Each structure stands twice: as structure tokens, then as C-alpha cells.
From a paper:
Named Tric1 and Tric2 (tRNA import component 1 and tRNA import component 2), these almost identical proteins belong to the preprotein and amino acid transporters (PRAT) family of proteins but are distinct from other PRATs in that they also contain a C-terminal SAM (sterile-alpha-motif) domain. In Arabidopsis Tric1 and Tric2 SAM domains have been shown to bind tRNAala via key lysine residues at positions 205 and 210 and are required for tRNA import into the mitochondria in vivo. The protein adopts a characteristic fold consisting of a 5-alpha-helical bundle.
The asymmetric unit of the crystal for the WT structure contains three monomers with identical contacts between the three protein chains. Further analysis of the crystal lattice revealed a helical superstructure, similar to other SAM domains. Besides the lateral interactions, intermolecular hydrogen bond interactions between the side chain nitrogen atom of Lys217 of one monomer and the main chain oxygen atoms of Ile250, Asp253 and Ile256 at the C-terminus of the domain on a neighboring symmetry related monomer parallel to the helical axis further strengthen the superstructure formed in the crystal lattice. Pure SAM domain eluted from the column as two main species, an oligomer at a retention volume of ∼58 ml, and a further peak at a retention volume of ∼90 ml, representing the monomeric SAM domain. Interestingly, both the heated and unheated oligomeric samples appeared on the blot at approximately 50 kDa, a higher molecular weight than would be expected for the monomer (∼11 kDa). This suggests that WT SAM domain forms a highly thermally stable oligomeric form in solution.
Residue numbers in the entry: 193 to 257
């Protein structure tokens, strides 16, 4: 939970809260957020639209280290 708090915040902001399970399953912990790639999110079973929204968020939000 505490290792996933910032990721949960991003998903809530994107309207993608359903994929928090996918982040946990993939061990997409908060240190991974600045490093996410399309390949990693696809391996976590996130569909194309949500991947685009997540990747754009991490490239734009200065909240993501």
C-alpha cells in the first residue's frame, strides 16, 4: 500500500483506478513511476488507451519524480 500511494494518486487523477490491481501485480511500485514504458504496462495487462494516458502523465506531471 505505502509503496503504491503515488501510483494510486495518479490513477485516481486519470480515472484509471481499476488498474491499481495491475500495478500491484506487476510490482509497479512508486519508484517505478518515472520509469514506466509501454512494454512494462502492456506486460501488466493494461490496454492501449490507459497506457497512453499513464505514459503522458508521467512525462508531464512534475509530481512524478
Amino acid at each position: 500500500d505505502p509503496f503504491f500511494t503515488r501510483g494510486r494518486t495518479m490513477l485516481v487523477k486519470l480515472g484509471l483506478e481499476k488498474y491499481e490491481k495491475n500495478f500491484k501485480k506487476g510490482l509497479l511500485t512508486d519508484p517505478t513511476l518515472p520509469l514506466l514504458t509501454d512494454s512494462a504496462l502492456k506486460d501488466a495487462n493494461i490496454p492501449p488507451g490507459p497506457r497512453l494516458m499513464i505514459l503522458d502523465h508521467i512525462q508531464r506531471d512534475p509530481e512524478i519524480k
